[PDB]
Structures are given as structure tokens and as C-alpha cells.
Amino acid sequence: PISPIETVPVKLKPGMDGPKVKQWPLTEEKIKALVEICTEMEKEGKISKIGPENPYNTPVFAIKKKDSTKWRKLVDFRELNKRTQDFWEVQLGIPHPAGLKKKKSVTVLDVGDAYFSVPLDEDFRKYTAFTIPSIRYQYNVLPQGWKGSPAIFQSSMTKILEPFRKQNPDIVIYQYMDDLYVGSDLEIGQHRTKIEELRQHLLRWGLTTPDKKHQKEPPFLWMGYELHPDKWTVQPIVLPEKDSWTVNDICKLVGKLNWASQIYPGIKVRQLSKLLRGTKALTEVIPLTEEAELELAENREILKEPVHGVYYDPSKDLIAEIQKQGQGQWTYQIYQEPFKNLKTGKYARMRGAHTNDVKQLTEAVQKITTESIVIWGKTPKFKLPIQKETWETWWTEYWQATWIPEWEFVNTPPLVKLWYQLEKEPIVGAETFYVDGAANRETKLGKAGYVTNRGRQKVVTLTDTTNQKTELQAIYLALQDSGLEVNIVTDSQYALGIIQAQPDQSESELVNQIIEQLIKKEKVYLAWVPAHKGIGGNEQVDKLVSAGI
Amino acid sequence: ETVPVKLKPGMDGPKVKQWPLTEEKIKALVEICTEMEKEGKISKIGPENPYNTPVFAIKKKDSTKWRKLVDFRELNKRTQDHPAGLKKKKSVTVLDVGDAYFSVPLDEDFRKYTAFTIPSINNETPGIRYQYNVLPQGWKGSPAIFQSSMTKILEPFRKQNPDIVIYQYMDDLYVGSDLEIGQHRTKIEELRQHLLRWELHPDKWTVQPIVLPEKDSWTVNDIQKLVGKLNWASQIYPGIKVRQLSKLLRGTKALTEVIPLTEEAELELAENREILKEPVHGVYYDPSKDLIAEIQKQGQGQWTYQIYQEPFKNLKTGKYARMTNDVKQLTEAVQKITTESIVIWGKTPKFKLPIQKETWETWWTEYWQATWIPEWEFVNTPPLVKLWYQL
DNA sequence: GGGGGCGCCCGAACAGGGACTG
DNA sequence: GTCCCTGTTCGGGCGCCC
Ligand SMILES: Nc1ccn([C@@H]2CS[C@H](COP(=O)(O)OP(=O)(O)OP(=O)(O)O)O2)c(=O)n1
Numbered sequence A: 001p002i003s004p005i006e007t008v009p010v011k012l013k014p015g016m017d018g019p020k021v022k023q024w025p026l027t028e029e030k031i032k033a034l035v036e037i038c039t040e041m042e043k044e045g046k047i048s049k050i051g052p053e054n055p056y057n058t059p060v061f062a063i064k065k066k067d068s069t070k071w072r073k074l075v076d077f078r079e080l081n082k083r084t085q086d087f088w089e090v091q092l093g094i095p096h097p098a099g100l101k102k103k104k105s106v107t108v109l110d111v112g113d114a115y116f117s118v119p120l121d122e123d124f125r126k127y128t129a130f131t132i133p134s135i136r137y138q139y140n141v142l143p144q145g146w147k148g149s150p151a152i153f154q155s156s157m158t159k160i161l162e163p164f165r166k167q168n169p170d171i172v173i174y175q176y177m178d179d180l181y182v183g184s185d186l187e188i189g190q191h192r193t194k195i196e197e198l199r200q201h202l203l204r205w206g207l208t209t210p211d212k213k214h215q216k217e218p219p220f221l222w223m224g225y226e227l228h229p230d231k232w233t234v235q236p237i238v239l240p241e242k243d244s245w246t247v248n249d250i251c252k253l254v255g256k257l258n259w260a261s262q263i264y265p266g267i268k269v270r271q272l273s274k275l276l277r278g279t280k281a282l283t284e285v286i287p288l289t290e291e292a293e294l295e296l297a298e299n300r301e302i303l304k305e306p307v308h309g310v311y312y313d314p315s316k317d318l319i320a321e322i323q324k325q326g327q328g329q330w331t332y333q334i335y336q337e338p339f340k341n342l343k344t345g346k347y348a349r350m351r352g353a354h355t356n357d358v359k360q361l362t363e364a365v366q367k368i369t370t371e372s373i374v375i376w377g378k379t380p381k382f383k384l385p386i387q388k389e390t391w392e393t394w395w396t397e398y399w400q401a402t403w404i405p406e407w408e409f410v411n412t413p414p415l416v417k418l419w420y421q422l423e424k425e426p427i428v429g430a431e432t433f434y435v436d437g438a439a440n441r442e443t444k445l446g447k448a449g450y451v452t453n454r455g456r457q458k459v460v461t462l463t464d465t466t467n468q469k470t471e472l473q474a475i476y477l478a479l480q481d482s483g484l485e486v487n488i489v490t491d492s493q494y495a496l497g498i499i500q501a502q503p504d505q506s507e508s509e510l511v512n513q514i515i516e517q518l519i520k521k522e523k524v525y526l527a528w529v530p531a532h533k534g535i536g537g538n539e540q541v542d543k544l545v546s547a548g549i
Numbered sequence B: 001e002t003v004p005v006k007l008k009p010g011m012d013g014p015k016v017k018q019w020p021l022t023e024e025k026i027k028a029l030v031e032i033c034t035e036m037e038k039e040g041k042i043s044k045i046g047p048e049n050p051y052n053t054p055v056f057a058i059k060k061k062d063s064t065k066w067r068k069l070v071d072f073r074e075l076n077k078r079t080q081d082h083p084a085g086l087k088k089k090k091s092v093t094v095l096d097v098g099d100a101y102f103s104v105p106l107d108e109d110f111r112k113y114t115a116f117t118i119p120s121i122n123n124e125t126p127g128i129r130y131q132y133n134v135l136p137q138g139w140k141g142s143p144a145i146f147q148s149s150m151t152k153i154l155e156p157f158r159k160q161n162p163d164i165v166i167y168q169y170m171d172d173l174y175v176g177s178d179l180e181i182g183q184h185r186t187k188i189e190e191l192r193q194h195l196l197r198w199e200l201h202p203d204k205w206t207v208q209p210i211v212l213p214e215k216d217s218w219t220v221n222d223i224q225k226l227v228g229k230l231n232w233a234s235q236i237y238p239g240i241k242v243r244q245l246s247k248l249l250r251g252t253k254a255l256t257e258v259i260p261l262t263e264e265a266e267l268e269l270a271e272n273r274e275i276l277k278e279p280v281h282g283v284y285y286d287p288s289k290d291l292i293a294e295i296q297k298q299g300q301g302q303w304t305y306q307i308y309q310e311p312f313k314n315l316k317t318g319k320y321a322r323m324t325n326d327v328k329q330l331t332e333a334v335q336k337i338t339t340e341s342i343v344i345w346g347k348t349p350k351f352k353l354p355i356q357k358e359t360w361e362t363w364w365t366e367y368w369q370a371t372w373i374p375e376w377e378f379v380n381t382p383p384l385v386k387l388w389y390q391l
Numbered sequence C: 001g002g003g004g005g006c007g008c009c010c011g012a013a014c015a016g017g018g019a020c021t022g
Numbered sequence D: 001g002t003c004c005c006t007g008t009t010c011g012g013g014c015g016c017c018c
């Protein structure tokens, strides 16, 4: 039945007109499914036969559903979509079972032929013209394939449920498209009474709730999960098992793993993700690197284990704990009571040419905080593998504002640490290296080198280089040629900026080499001076490396 | 009857995504909005309205009352197109006159640009969308449209209290006097009664001059730091010089070698110390350009800032000290600096914040207490200028 | 062979600051 | 100015939901 809900007014984008795109061949099997659907819809007013008054046309097809018993009629409105006005999507995210609170009674209802029970704006119907190849119809209800259909449905649904929500403040209705989870703290008799009231309410507005898709007993099938009374489980995840992997099949693999990591702790996708780098198209085959095929195997082992998650109790604390997985990879577990996860997850985003473990930890914390706020509407307390004093040192020597919410240290290696610490004051009995580099923008030739207060000097010629590079190379040279304690004077804000933020990881091989050196040293002090102002003996090394460039 | 309002030419309305809110804030927002909806000030709308603007809520001081805050910065950027004595007053008081705006209806064809969306915890529901029917708090059009009515309400109070300066900026009324505190406060309450019927001290504010080390022995390193600092500062004060100090560094010396200061290098260091105690010459505030604010973290709860419109042409330079939570302190710093700007030039600065974007966005609304919100951008402070403004 | 949402990873485009040419 | 390097956005795959 069609809802007596007011239609939602919709326009084409200006200066534009409906699609005139011609039907495409269709399987004999599909055509019967379509006619069967269309003579039914047409009978019910869902669609109206049109004549030659209607210039427009858009192509229709059909795919078979999960029920493996009914067809889904689709329209490729890709052209009408581009010409249709913008909507503000009202679906802001995806509900998560970990954010559900324990309920005495629970129901899951599906709405029947949901879209086709919501009327489409009358002045807009004409553009939805379609042809069922051997009749010509238009839509009077929302079409599956049009881009306005989801927001108009979700929004319409919210209007319809609002009276019921107001009247029944303490019944919880999770509303994802046409699918409803209904929770109550009523005993099963009184709850079933409310469900019937909710179904009569829906029916009045033309939305049916077929018993076939009305679930009354645990476990409930909801949003890709199985909901048991005291625990939830993700419906089983099956990873592919090829020998030849394409980009498209790495990309589908990474996806299931990421999906999996919401409840399977430890999942890692760095080595797999890196294979995707540089590739040209989906067709492409890539050879699993030995670290990639290794990583894949560990994940495979992880997924073989049995895991569940629990529901949320607002009278307890939210605890998040994080583990360092190496290489800019992190897993976390959110819980309230020990060894009973609410949910898990991973952070692995590489932000920055150069960074270190404390920064990456701070980003993981920030990602988890935002995610906790979506799911539970509050921030969790943290358990982190980083000493209070490591953090305090970092916050003291980093020139940026940084902060981690309430947290406590957990001694679960590998601990997050700073791998070296530049001196705040120059070093007595340390040789002073004045470094520098220049490069010729046209030839791409350069020189890097130093001069020291003890009379040493050295110039290294470079090819296909850049001024920044030569400046990093000079610092690498002073580090290579110095003792365990070294004073380095540079004129490069560039170089000084990277090294002073204390990276332990970098995209740059040269910066990595530098880092390796900085870790070996006992003491390094890095100072800056303005270039080309005759400051000795920045001046002296400037002549050495400028010569010939 | 309604004042027509338009967008700047060739600009569409805001389309900014709502960010996630805490349970507390959503509860406040839903409570506030349902009653605003019952008073006719906002209307539920659908998704065919393509526009959006973020909302949240701050709860004040010691209270149990929240204030909605629509982040109208984008809409204000796209909306169609100051008492010098205010910065002298011994006390300045700041009142929230936002409620006044809901008495004036809003141009029908403009309402759609004021759309906002309320999120649900764990996305239990799609967002709930509203638009305004009256002058929205935080829109730049609101004080403009309501100005005429505002002048008429203050008029008797102003006449009878000639030595009280009252300034309006957005939802705010700045009220300054030279009265003793108590007589000042009794006056403020006189005005609230007056408005019902229908603390700042801009003396204390002081500039933070650039500083030069003074000490009895200098090492090569000390002098190298000094020459680098002075070289930078000479972009602000062209009267700074560094030739004599730099000739002490001739050769290739150890950083910790002690360099005795020659007579002229002692002298040149003396001038510089004085050239720094001058005002920056030739800086003229221009309203056609944004105020720009830089903030540098100096550690130990110390924050330095400069306000300018063109590089090295500072209008003000200052310091902000606190008691530790960097993000909070930074958010407090930003409010104090904005406050000063509104009081001094009647405009809001654009901030260059020394913080990571996600770090700031994750937490800044936990510490926000103003009814306006300044433009900002995030930058990584080159560690050098951190040294330049150093304590 | 269609849609909207969120997530993840990637590369492309573009913005902004520093260093350089003479 | 140009070139270099770094950050951000944003659109393209894929995952999952309906
Ligand atoms: N791949 C999909 C799935 C759903 N939809 C939309 C959004 S939810 C809405 C549901 O329509 P139906 O009533 O035909 O749902 P189903 O076929 O799932 O169960 P029935 O109730 O048996 O009819 O269809 C879509 O455009 N594309």
C-alpha cells in the first residue's frame, strides 16, 4: 500500500532536462520477472502507463536477491542522477552493536516493499519514464537507482516514527533504512503489545511489516551481526584463497580484513596495502611480497579463532587499550570489564613524510576518541604502552600543542619510546661541524660537506640532487664522520625542522640513514644560523660546497 | 515585515558536514530545539534542502544550562556585505544578547541557508534537520538587521549614562565604564533590567616586546643564537644591526668557546636593545583585510602571539600564561586573543594554530565558552620563530 | 550494468612556505 | 618569478549495511 505521507518536492538542476537514454537488451528471464513485477505495481498504482507525451527514458534491469526467491527491479538512473538537484544526506553513519545497551525484550522488523510504499513528487514523475521490452511506464513511488531515494526514504521514515517515539520515549528503535531494531525493558507480554502498536502505526502510514521478516527470538540477524542476549557476533568472514592475486582482489581482501578488525584483535594490512602502490588498474596482477604473504597468513590464523563482543553498560567506564604492532600499525580493544571486549579496531594511517611513535600513538588515541563519541557519546579512559615520563619529555620538547586524554600506563611491549634526544645546550668536548650543501637547479649537480673546528673538511659531490637533499646529506656526513658526541651547525630550516621533531620513521631513505646515526650517538646538538651572512665558519663551508655550482 | 537578504554574487550556501557530538550535547540540543520548534523559531525540514551548518552546545561556568551554538562561519563568509574609547575603560563587561534576535523574523528565501542537522548517538536514527524562521544567533546578518531596534533600546540608558560605552558584536554586547567595581556591576545590572524590560579590563592588556639575553660571558653558541635572532628581528625593526656581533664569529670555532665582547659589539648590542623598545613604525589597521593571529607554544604554560595583517607589520604582540592541557590552554588563548581583537578593532582574527588539525577538532568544543567562532587554519610552527618570541 | 551511508587505502590535484637567480 | 617539499582534499577502487 502507498503511504499518505506528503511527497518531498524535487527539481532537476537548472538548465537541464530529463534523460533520453535508450533501453538495453535484456535476458528473457529478467523480462518475465519485470513484467510480473510491473503488472503488479501498475495494478497497485505504484507505476502508471505513459504515452508519447513522455519523451524521456531510462534503462531498467533486475538482479536476484539473498532470499534467492524474489527479483529486485533496478533502474540505471545514472544520467537522471547527474541532472537531479543535490540533497543533504541524513544518514550520518552506521549503528554498531557495541553501542546497544542490554534490553529485556527485542524485536527486529523489516518493512515490506519499503521504497514502493513512499510516493514520489508528482511534478517529477515524468523523468522516471522507463520501458519494459517485449509497455512504457513512469514511477509514482521511489525508484531503486535514483539518488534521492535513500534520503527521502530515511527522512520520511523519521517523520512517520516521530509520533510513536514521542509517545513511547522509553522504547528504543534503531532505524537503518527499512530495518528496525526495537528494544524495551518490558516483560515479553507487554513488549509484544508495544510491537503491535508500532506495526499498526506503521500500517496506518502504508508501511507493512510481513511476519516472514519479523524476528521474535534470539539470535537476531541485524546489520550483518548475530545478536544473542549477552553477546554479539559478526556473521562469518570468508577470505579468498587464490594463487594469482589481482589489484581488485587485494582490494577485496583488505576490505574484509578491515571489516573483520572491528572484533578480531590484531589484524594487520600494511604489507597487503603497500602492494596496491603505483598500480595502473584493477585487472593487474601483483606478486605477494614475502612479508605480504606472511602477513596474510597471520590474519588467516587470527580469523580461525572464535570471538564475540558484548553490549554497553553506561554505569561502567569505557576503557580503551592500545598495542604497538610495529611499522605504524596499532590495534586497540575497547571494553568495560576485563577480557570482555565491546569492540576492537586498528589504526595504520601513514600521516607525514617523517614521524615517530609518539605522534602515531597520539593519532591513534584521537581516532579512537572520535569513534567512541559516535558509538557511545563519550570518550573512553586509555591504557597505553608509553611511560608517563616519555610522554612528558615529548610534550616538553615538541613545539606544537599536543594532548592525550586521561590515561594510564600498561607494560605490554613493544613500549612506545623516543629513540634519541637532541641536546638543549651545546656539548663540551664535542667536535663542532659546520655543514652545508648547494645544488645547481639546472644541471641537478650538487655538493654536500662540512668544515670542523679541529681543521677537518670534506666535500661530497652529488648528482641528480636538490638543494634540500644536499643539505640533509651534509648533516648525514657530519654524523658519519664524527664521534659519539657531535655539535652540528646548519643553515637549513628544512633540515633543522625534520631532525628537531625527532622522527624514527621516514619515507626518505636518506632521512632514515640519518635517523640510524642519531640513534647510535651519545649526544647530538643541532644549531641553526642564517645563511650567507659571513658567520664563520658557516661561511667557510659555504665556499667549499658552492664552488663549481 | 522582513528585510530581504542575499548571498554574495556567485556563491552557493554552506554545505558543511555535522561533526560527532557527545551524549550530553545532543541531549541539550534536542531539548533546546524541540522548544524552539514549539515557539516557531525553527522548522523541521527534509533532505531536499541541500544546505548545512554544524551545531553543538556549550554549558556555562557553574550552570546546568546549555547554549546552542551554530557554527555559521561559512554562511557568514558568503552572506552579502567601532568605538575607540572602548579599549580604555577600567572595566568592560560582556553580555549575551542573542535572545533578542528571535523577535525578528527571517527572510523566507534565505531561511534555507540556515539549515542544520542533529546527530544521534550510535546513529540510532538519521539526522534531524531544522532551518531558522527568525534571526539566528551567530549569523552576521542578525546584528545588522536588528541594529535599528538595538539603538532604540539602548538610547535612554546611553543618554542617562553618557560615560558608559556600549558596543555590540554579533551576539555580544560589550559594556565599558571607569566606575569602581560594584558601581560598575550595579550599572550592568541596571542595563539587564533595562533589556529585560523590552570581567574585562582593557587597561591591563600589554604588549610583549622582543627580548635580548644579557649575560657576563658569551660563548660562540650564545652569539650565534643572538645574531640569528637579531637578523630575523631586523625584518620587523629595520634599525637592528649585526655586523660587529658577527665579526666576533670569524673563523671556525668550537660552539662552547668563550668569546669576549669587543667595545663596539657591546655597543651595537646596546642600541639593538633600545631599537627594540620602539613601536613598530608604519602599521595601519586596514578593515578591508583580515586580522591574522599567530600563536607559538613557549612551554611551561606560556604562549606568545602576534596580530598583524601583513608580514612583520604587527598591530599587537602579546603573551598568554597559564597554570596541564595544551589543547585547552590553546583554546583559552584563542578566545582571549579574539576578545581583545573585537575590543580593539571590532573584528575577529584569522588564526594560524600550532596544532594538528585532528587534535584540535577532536577537543576544542570541550573548552569553548564564546558565542562567536573565529576562522582558523592549522600550521606547523617553524621551530625558529618559537625562539624569536621566547621568554 | 543502479542508489545512499560509513570505513580503508591510494594517487592526483592544489596550497603554502623556503631557497634560489642575478 | 621557479623548483622543491609537505600537507590537505577529494575522488576512485574495495569492504559492510539496506
Ligand atoms: N541493493 C539494495 C538494497 C536495498 N535498496 C533499497 C534501500 S532499503 C529498500 C528496501 O526495499 P524492499 O522492500 O524491496 O526490501 P527487501 O527486498 O530488502 O525485502 P522485502 O521487504 O521482502 O521486499 O531498498 C537498494 O536501493 N539497493
Ligand SMILES: [Mg+2]
Residues within 6 Å of the ligand: A110, A111, A112, A113, A114, A178
Ligand atoms: Mg524490506
